[PDB]
Design a protein around this ligand. Structure first.
Ligand SMILES: [Zn+2]
Ligand SMILES: [Zn+2]
Length: 157
């Protein structure tokens, strides 16, 4: 449960009338779940048309660029109209983790390939063929990588 505050202030074309009645801004808010607790979701600041006789909607849409997670909320704002739609097209909290695995996959390939190196060397000292090959994403024998890498179970065995 996270509050997202939205500040609305008059456009240039309505600012004089807003001043005349002394109503210079609206501060409103909506709420969102943990899915959208990410750095790129920040309290917006908007310009809209002050109008003394209308109530407008502010709409805030969230959508993940990597998955189809999405969320729509809205709130009424007195005396402001034509409020720009707010869109957060972001990488959601669950997808943030998935793209970061690249640093893990790479580290684990480095480790494995060190062990492959050692096995090949040992084999050359025992008079067996040194048949193992280093891993990459296109040819990987770590079972937990399957999908992120092309799992080739018997690559090195
Ligand atoms: Zn996502
Ligand atoms: Zn791999």
């Amino acid at each position: 449960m996270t509050r997202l505050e939205v500040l609305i202030r008059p456009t240039e074309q309505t600012a004089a009338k807003a001043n005349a009645v002394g109503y210079t801004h609206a501060l409103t808010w909506v709420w969102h779940s943990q899915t959208w607790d990410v750095d790129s979701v920040r309290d917006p600041s908007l310009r809209a048309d002050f109008n003394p006789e209308k109530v407008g909607w502010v709409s805030v849409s969230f959508a993940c660029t990597q998955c189809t997670a999405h969320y729509y909320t809205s709130e009424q704002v007195k005396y402001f109209t034509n409020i720009p739609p707010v869109h957060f097209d972001v990488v959601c909290a669950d997808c943030e983790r998935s793209v970061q695995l690249d640093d893990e996959i790479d580290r684990e390939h480095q480790e494995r390939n060190a062990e492959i190196s050692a096995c090949n060397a040992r084999a050359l000292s025992e008079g067996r063929p040194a048949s193992l090959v280093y891993l990459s994403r296109d040819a990987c024998d770590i079972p937990e990588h399957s999908g992120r890498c092309r799992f080739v179970k018997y690559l090195n065995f």
